[PDB]
Amino acid sequence: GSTGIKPFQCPDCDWSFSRSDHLALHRKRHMLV
């Protein structure tokens, strides 16, 4: 049906997280801030 999209998504790997902190835990390696 639909794609496995989540409210918090990585625009780099196309990762999907149901939790904001989980996405941040992932995208921090993209941000390096």
C-alpha–C-alpha distance, residues 16 and 23, integer Å = 7
Q: Which is nearer to Zn ion, 6 or 10 (CB)?
A: 10
Of 1, 23, 21, nearest to 12 (Cα)?
A: 23
Q: Which is nearer to Zn ion, 1 or 30 (CB)?
A: 30
Minimum separation from the CB atom of position 30 to Zn ion (A): 6
Residues that bind Zn ion (CB under 5 A): 10, 12-13, 15
Q: Which is nearer to Zn ion, 1 or 17 (CB)?
A: 17
C-alpha–C-alpha distance, residues 15 and 11, integer Å = 7
